[PDB]
Structure 1
Amino acid sequence: AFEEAEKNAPAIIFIDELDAIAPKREKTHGEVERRIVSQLLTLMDGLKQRAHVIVMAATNRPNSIDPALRRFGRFDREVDIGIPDATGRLEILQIHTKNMKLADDVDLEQVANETHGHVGADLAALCSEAALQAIRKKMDLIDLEDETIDAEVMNSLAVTMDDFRWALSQSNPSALRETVVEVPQVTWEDIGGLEDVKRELQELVQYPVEHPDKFLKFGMTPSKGVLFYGPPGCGKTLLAKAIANECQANFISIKGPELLTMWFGESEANVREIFDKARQAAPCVLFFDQLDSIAKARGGNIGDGGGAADRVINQILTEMDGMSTKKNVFIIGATNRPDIIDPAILRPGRLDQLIYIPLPDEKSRVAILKANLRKSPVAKDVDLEFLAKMTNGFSGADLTEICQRACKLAIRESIESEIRRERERQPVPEIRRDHFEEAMRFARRSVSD
């Protein structure tokens, strides 16, 4: 290959999947592959004396390339083809959609603004999905079993803005495809109270991406860490769900102990790759549920057991320091046992902001009771103010289970009435005060003082 490159000059050599042919020599366990890596190094050295031949390589994994290949004189210039920003996404959309039969109503700038982490292949996926939806709209008139299509239907073919809206609802970045979970539909008015915390979260998620200019003007680097700590059942995971559904920033939701693996070094590799795929999709929100599972007080693991927990937390602190300020990755940690958390992760620069989710107050309890019953037919005689008054120490989960007990009693009564009517053959339009009274009789406080 290098000979044929030399014979015909000037020439370009393209090596696709470089990490496939050139892994680390010390990692490789095969003689032939080590010989091949050495051959590549020698051929770069020979290329140095070559006049008109330039080699270009592409790799998904920059790290897997042998560090000697990254040394000066061999692949001297490295170009990082990062994810596009909003203007770049608009340019890609305009280039792709030159041949397509776009309608007049569609404007590409909105579509560019909507997408966050798409890398240019996801945009093509979005365009194809929208075209497929447009074709689906015409499949009532024309059937698949049919052999020919009328020319009028063919002229009817066009992509509207409804199609791009459908595709944007369906779309998802390829990197996040590995780690996606079905999150229940939760909106900001579903959460009762905590208005200050809602506004703070909206600010901290929206300001650095929307207006970095103010932060650079005042010389303040924005805080990229939040810690949620409070009693059980107060709404940390609920706020995470709301941020996932509503906010326009990618969400990576992870349980705590899911990173850990018995093999040596796998847990650190998982931490590195999760932070990596968080960077690739910025602006992204990385939510650590049950943070005390991973970050515990150092030295206990070394004292008893393998001790890999200490190396995991060291790796997490390293990756937290590594990410740049300009990059939009916001890290949220939720915990209901804040005391066992390693103080190193609370040190300034990492999880700077600490938000305490308090046990709800009277107005908070009123808001919670209103929010829970918004979708349920409830009699006007039901007084939520009295329920908030009586439940002084109840948390949000307790109020929810009170309402669920009322609903279950209503269901039971309806089933009894239905069985009575069926038996005589061979009621409850809404939850009343009786159901709430019985549910309150079954109520109990989840969190002690």
Structure 2
Amino acid sequence: NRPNRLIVDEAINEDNSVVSLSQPKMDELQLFRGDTVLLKGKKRREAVCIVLSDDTCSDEKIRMNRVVRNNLRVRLGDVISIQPCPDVKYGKRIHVLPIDDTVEGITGNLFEVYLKPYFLEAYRPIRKGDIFLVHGGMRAVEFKVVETDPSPYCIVAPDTVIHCEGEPIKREDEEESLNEVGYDDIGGCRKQLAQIKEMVELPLRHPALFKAIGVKPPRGILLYGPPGTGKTLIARAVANETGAFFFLINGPEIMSKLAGESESNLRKAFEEAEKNAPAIIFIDELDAIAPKREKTHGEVERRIVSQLLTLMDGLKQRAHVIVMAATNRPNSIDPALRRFGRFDREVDIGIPDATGRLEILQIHTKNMKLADDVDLEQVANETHGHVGADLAALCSEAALQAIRKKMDLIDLIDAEVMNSLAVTMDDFRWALSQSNPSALRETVVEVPQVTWEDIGGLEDVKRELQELVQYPVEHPDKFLKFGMTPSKGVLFYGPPGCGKTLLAKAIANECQANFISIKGPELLTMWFGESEANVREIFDKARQAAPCVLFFDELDSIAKARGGAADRVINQILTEMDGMSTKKNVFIIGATNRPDIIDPAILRPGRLDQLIYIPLPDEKSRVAILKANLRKSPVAKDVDLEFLAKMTNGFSGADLTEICQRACKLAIRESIESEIRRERERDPVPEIRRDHFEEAMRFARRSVSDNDIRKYEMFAQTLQQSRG
């Protein structure tokens, strides 16, 4: 019953950095005798204290001082939580500002009297906003922590210089903390942050693995993606949690020097890294430093590229030094830069998802005083992909026009005036309208949430799809039990449908793999432009997602609209499909409307084997389709689903949903009529009448063509695989 929940109690020791806990609860939570722990309290206040074993302490209870109790915003009788946290390390710079009510009557230097004997070889861990009491001179002085450079996880080291500028804290928004560190500051890329933590954390804290590993597994990792999602945020976050020399440099500053000094500050930069033992050295927009060889006009840039290559080659296992790098695309940089042995594992970042956008919004609204009238969850639902810098600008613009909405002050401003940030739904909607999708052209990598709702049919077909895709994801050893090579290629055909796209999204949701939808018009745009190298970039992004579901729609449309079978993308599709790993579960699902016009090489056994005709949707199972209509205008009751199950016999699914939304549009225009009548006098009637459904039935016909469905039956008779 989550045994991290503890009970606050009075301490035995008088220290503000020592808590008392029982012996059987220390071994259950996997903690040492001097382990650092994450103690969460109320008003999102947290603290780190060194746990000591106490014989008189209860198992369920934890003993802590009145300083720790008041810092955690709890009284006697509340509950706290504990998390094992061994990566709490030393600090670089610590700024302290004493509270004004406890510094009256004392003048002089308080650094050698209060700050120096309190932290003398004690290894006390603290947090931001921690108020700890320091005695001396027959008094007791409260000290409030402003900022330490390992901000969430620090331990006060004897080598840490304490900034002790004697001044009371001003009663405004003028705190001296600025741009410190954070794993709480990185927004929404946990599924790749765990990967890069796995790569570069093994250089941290373990030089002893070099005998077993022979050669160090990282030498360099590129961080590519669309601009605006934090190359330097990721690199500064992984810095100072480990504790090293960061030393950010940027490519414009490298190229800004003249001749003879552009060659300089590169061996100088790497030697200035080499004075320190670790290195997380990061270069900003390195694509400007190293473009393609054909893109280079002058040769000074080629000299800079050669200098970078010599430094990367010569800095081979020179006492665990790692070079971080970022760019836009793998093909944007020199292909000679991707030599195997250095800058090898080009991990992807990508656009954040809706949950990632939500926690980006949460983190960027942590510091500013929200009015809490908003819930902010659905704000990430209207956007179709805006990058983290765009969401930071979104928050800034929303707060700016919210301040602009209210009037200016008396002159020139208090913090409580700054605490009155009454952001509304319409404020965030206005900021959303007053923005731009700077990364909408990029393919969006996300998991979907269809979760088996739109399709109430296809009973054995969904069983086949489940055993073909989901069953290798949970256990692929059964295919090696009897020797099965899975056929990743599946094709869906018949009358046109987005329900097969919803089926593919449900499959990718069940596997919980990222889903990438390749657009048919995008393939047509690549066909008219004859840019066959873009699908190489598509498959390179696809193979980085393991596992992944790759969807293609209307492959017959390329041969149908060929007017410049045989096509430039089609042979490239066949070549890339031949060049696929049989593992990684990168399953290809295809959609088409006219199976008569198709590549005959793709219907060959091999890559694409199973050919499934998707039939008309079930009129008897329209309950699930109106359940999908029960979101996005929920219809009120005293309506008949049998009324839509009586005369509807061959009507399409999305046709039924859009005619339900057309009846919803009739309800919206009659609600507007009701509001117009109510304003003309001087409830919106949310229920939907049966007359809207009757006019919907009289204004909807099927898209079903008889010649098309008998040719689909002829395709089924041609591929007749039936039990005798």
TM-score category by the smaller chain?
0.5 to 0.7
On the 8 A contact 2:370/2:421 being kept in 1, the answer is: no
On the 8 A contact 2:387/2:439 being kept in 1, the answer is: no
Of 181, 193, 205, the residue aligned with 2:445 is 181
On the 8 A contact 2:348/2:544 being kept in 1, the answer is: no
Aligned-residue offset at 1:151 = 21
Whole-angstrom CA distance in 1 between matches of 2:680 and 2:365: 65
Q: Structure 1 residues 118 and 285 mapped into 2: Cα distance closer, same or farther (>3 Å)?
A: farther
On the 8 A contact 1:297/1:343 being kept in 2, the answer is: no
On the 8 A contact 1:235/1:357 being kept in 2, the answer is: no
Paired residue for 1:247?
Answer: 511
Aligned-residue offset at 1:436 = 1.8
Aligned-residue offset at 1:381 = 3.9
Aligned-residue offset at 1:221 = 0.8
- Using the TM superposition, name which of 78-87 and 433-442 deviates more: 78-87
Aligned-residue offset at 1:180 = 0.9
Q: Structure 1 residues 135 and 281 mapped into 2: Cα distance closer, same or farther (>3 Å)?
A: farther
Aligned-residue offset at 1:286 = 1.2
Aligned-residue offset at 1:288 = 1.4
Aligned-residue offset at 1:330 = 1.0
Whole-angstrom CA distance in 2 between matches of 1:183 and 1:9: 41
Whole-angstrom CA distance in 1 between matches of 2:359 and 2:681: 71
Paired residue for 1:301?
Answer: none
Whole-angstrom CA distance in 2 between matches of 1:112 and 1:422: 34
On the 8 A contact 2:666/2:692 being kept in 1, the answer is: yes
Whole-angstrom CA distance in 2 between matches of 1:326 and 1:141: 65
Deviations 1:234-288 (A, max 9, x none): 6123334445556411111121242566899962210111111101111111111
- Using the TM superposition, name which of 323-332 and 20-29 deviates more: 20-29
Please give the secondary structure, in 2, of the residue aligned with 1:355: strand
On the 8 A contact 1:254/1:288 being kept in 2, the answer is: yes
- Using the TM superposition, name which of 249-258 and 49-58 deviates more: 49-58
- Using the TM superposition, name which of 174-183 and 246-255 deviates more: 174-183
- Using the TM superposition, name which of 289-298 and 430-439 deviates more: 289-298
On the 8 A contact 1:117/1:280 being kept in 2, the answer is: no
On the 8 A contact 1:129/1:167 being kept in 2, the answer is: yes
- Using the TM superposition, name which of 336-345 and 111-120 deviates more: 111-120
On the 8 A contact 2:523/2:569 being kept in 1, the answer is: no
Aligned-residue offset at 1:212 = 1.4
Q: Which has the higher contact order (CA 8 A, sep 6+)?
A: 1
- Using the TM superposition, name which of 288-297 and 45-54 deviates more: 45-54
Mark the runs of 5 or more structure 1 residues left unpaired by the alignment: 299-305
Deviations 1:348-404 (A, max 9, x none): 222322222211133233432343236655454422224223111111123223322
Aligned-residue offset at 1:336 = 2.0
Whole-angstrom CA distance in 2 between matches of 1:86 and 1:417: 36
Q: Structure 1 residues 105 and 379 mapped into 2: Cα distance closer, same or farther (>3 Å)?
A: closer
- Using the TM superposition, name which of 336-345 and 404-413 deviates more: 404-413
Aligned-residue offset at 1:215 = 0.7
Deviations 1:179-227 (A, max 9, x none): 2179986342243433444444343332222211111111111111121
Q: Structure 1 residues 22 and 369 mapped into 2: Cα distance closer, same or farther (>3 Å)?
A: closer
Whole-angstrom CA distance in 1 between matches of 2:480 and 2:320: 45
Q: Structure 1 residues 63 and 221 mapped into 2: Cα distance closer, same or farther (>3 Å)?
A: farther
Aligned-residue offset at 1:155 = 24
Whole-angstrom CA distance in 2 between matches of 1:374 and 1:215: 40
On the 8 A contact 1:190/1:372 being kept in 2, the answer is: no
Query: Rg: which structure is higher?
Result: 2
Please give the secondary structure, in 1, of the residue aligned with 2:521: coil
Deviations 1:3-28 (A, max 9, x none): 99999999999999999999998998
Please give the secondary structure, in 2, of the residue aligned with 1:12: strand
Whole-angstrom CA distance in 2 between matches of 1:377 and 1:93: 28
Q: Structure 1 residues 340 and 102 mapped into 2: Cα distance closer, same or farther (>3 Å)?
A: same
Aligned-residue offset at 1:43 = 14
On the 8 A contact 1:378/1:432 being kept in 2, the answer is: no
- Using the TM superposition, name which of 284-293 and 61-70 deviates more: 61-70
Aligned length in residues: 437
On the 8 A contact 1:209/1:328 being kept in 2, the answer is: yes
- Using the TM superposition, name which of 49-58 and 102-111 deviates more: 102-111
On the 8 A contact 1:286/1:331 being kept in 2, the answer is: yes
Whole-angstrom CA distance in 2 between matches of 1:242 and 1:236: 10
Q: Structure 1 residues 284 and 10 mapped into 2: Cα distance closer, same or farther (>3 Å)?
A: closer
Q: Structure 1 residues 196 and 394 mapped into 2: Cα distance closer, same or farther (>3 Å)?
A: same
Please give the secondary structure, in 1, of the residue aligned with 2:549: strand
Please give the secondary structure, in 1, of the residue aligned with 2:646: helix
Whole-angstrom CA distance in 1 between matches of 2:376 and 2:590: 36
Whole-angstrom CA distance in 2 between matches of 1:277 and 1:416: 51
Q: Structure 1 residues 321 and 296 mapped into 2: Cα distance closer, same or farther (>3 Å)?
A: farther
Aligned-residue offset at 1:405 = 3.2
Of 109, 120, 129, the residue aligned with 2:397 is 129
Percent identity over paired residues: 99
Aligned-residue offset at 1:406 = 2.8
Whole-angstrom CA distance in 2 between matches of 1:151 and 1:65: 48
Please give the secondary structure, in 2, of the residue aligned with 1:228: strand
Whole-angstrom CA distance in 1 between matches of 2:350 and 2:673: 64
Paired residue for 1:101?
Answer: 369
Mark the runs of 5 or more structure 2 residues left unpaired by the alignment: 1-268, 705-723
Q: Structure 1 residues 377 and 310 mapped into 2: Cα distance closer, same or farther (>3 Å)?
A: closer
Whole-angstrom CA distance in 2 between matches of 1:162 and 1:206: 42
Please give the secondary structure, in 1, of the residue aligned with 2:620: helix
On the 8 A contact 1:249/1:284 being kept in 2, the answer is: yes
Paired residue for 1:329?
Answer: 586
On the 8 A contact 1:291/1:334 being kept in 2, the answer is: yes
Q: Structure 1 residues 261 and 308 mapped into 2: Cα distance closer, same or farther (>3 Å)?
A: farther
CA RMSD of aligned residues (A): 8.7
- Using the TM superposition, name which of 135-144 and 279-288 deviates more: 135-144
Whole-angstrom CA distance in 1 between matches of 2:684 and 2:420: 52
Whole-angstrom CA distance in 2 between matches of 1:432 and 1:113: 29
On the 8 A contact 1:292/1:341 being kept in 2, the answer is: yes
More helix by share: 1
Please give the secondary structure, in 2, of the residue aligned with 1:196: helix
Whole-angstrom CA distance in 2 between matches of 1:423 and 1:109: 37
Aligned-residue offset at 1:231 = 1.2
- Using the TM superposition, name which of 364-373 and 269-278 deviates more: 364-373
- Using the TM superposition, name which of 348-357 and 368-377 deviates more: 368-377
Whole-angstrom CA distance in 2 between matches of 1:407 and 1:92: 34
Please give the secondary structure, in 1, of the residue aligned with 2:454: coil
Whole-angstrom CA distance in 1 between matches of 2:693 and 2:672: 18
Q: Structure 1 residues 87 and 239 mapped into 2: Cα distance closer, same or farther (>3 Å)?
A: closer
Deviations 1:105-164 (A, max 9, x none): 9999999999999999999999999999999999999999xxxx9999999999999999
Matched, 1:114 2:382: yes
On the 8 A contact 2:384/2:440 being kept in 1, the answer is: no
Q: Structure 1 residues 98 and 372 mapped into 2: Cα distance closer, same or farther (>3 Å)?
A: closer
Whole-angstrom CA distance in 2 between matches of 1:99 and 1:285: 38
- Using the TM superposition, name which of 31-40 and 280-289 deviates more: 31-40
On the 8 A contact 2:546/2:585 being kept in 1, the answer is: yes
Q: Structure 1 residues 65 and 233 mapped into 2: Cα distance closer, same or farther (>3 Å)?
A: closer
Q: Structure 1 residues 26 and 239 mapped into 2: Cα distance closer, same or farther (>3 Å)?
A: same
- Using the TM superposition, name which of 70-79 and 125-134 deviates more: 125-134
| 1:244-393 matches, cutoff 5 A | 247-259=511-523, 267-294=531-558, 310-373=567-630, 376=633, 378=635, 380-393=637-650
Whole-angstrom CA distance in 2 between matches of 1:107 and 1:418: 28
Q: Structure 1 residues 311 and 362 mapped into 2: Cα distance closer, same or farther (>3 Å)?
A: closer
